[PDB]
Symmetry: C4
Subunit: 105 residues, 4 copies
């Protein structure tokens, strides 16, 4: 089990799970830069709520978008972790698309 500590919030996943998408922060060597030997875990000073959506992506290969979250904050987390371009699931695509436009008016 890999421990991904995001601003105090403990997340845990498998190395194999993350390796599913090389070519992202967590699935590549970029992750090494955030490791803390002393604690045997990776630390990220990022938003712990939005991170749930980042991690979930590794299992489904799909992204869900939380309506209640700010679209800018959401996109920033995707950009940071390398989920680019964003592959939003059909279930969430329209709302994400609509919010992006509204935010850009």
């Amino acid at each position: 089990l890999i421990v991904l500590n995001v601003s105090g919030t403990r997340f845990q996943t498998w190395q194999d799970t993350l390796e599913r998408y090389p070519d992202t922060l967590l699935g590549s060597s970029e992750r090494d830069f955030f490791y803390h030997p002393e604690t045997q875990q990776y630390f990220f000073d990022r938003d712990p709520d939005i991170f749930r959506h980042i991690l979930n992506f590794y299992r489904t290969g799909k992204l869900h978008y939380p309506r209640h979250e700010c679209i800018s904050a959401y996109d920033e987390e995707l950009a940071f972790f390398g989920l680019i371009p964003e592959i939003i699931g059909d279930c969430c695509y329209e709302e994400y698309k609509d919010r992006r436009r509204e935010n850009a008016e």
Copy 2:
């Protein structure tokens, strides 16, 4: 106390509570497959936020649906844990029904 670790988020309930609904993942032997002897807890690489609704069901025998959550992601968690068919409480039935239709258009 049974520890249900969902992607790093610790949940705890009673064995008796889960046994209330046999014929679901958590209330049956299916759960054994997710146990980790080394840590004395069960691990699930599933969504930790939506899991609250799964667990709550065992106490009430009823399900609540979070409006802010994606209906597809919600249903996927129900399908995974065996809460099938979903028994949504009257308080949440209509919104769940409406969202399911909208998502299927």
Copy 3:
């Protein structure tokens, strides 16, 4: 510091804080029934998300209502912990009032 473990989610407050409102579950002797000597903490198999609003009440003497939460589930937690009648802050009163009516139609 008093540890209030709600379905795996750790909450911590002061005994003095809870004693502010006698005549509620947490501020009275009713709480003793949920104590676990072995762990030096109280356990509640209740909703860990809604509990934030219960605890917050002790500091302000006022209650906030989360729009995204199901009003029935919300009221059930208030009923369980003895926050009766509910003293919803003016900031949240109307929405709570509106949702209660809608849920009762």
Copy 4:
């Protein structure tokens, strides 16, 4: 790593991060008053959900506003931690502005 325990919820950040904005509770000596030597961490009996937005501010110098949260409860947390005046990001400014007005009608 600095541990900021908010009502039982563990948050962690860097001293350098907090020092970015002197002239706030967390970035100044005001923080000392909340330290607990016995546990080597700071304790705050405040809302653990809204705190995510407080902490995030230190990294971006910008604030996001959660639509689902009560605007009064939100502003109270900003006032308490000294994020005054609030510097809401453009992405969230309008909604925050609108909600403030609605709450003041």
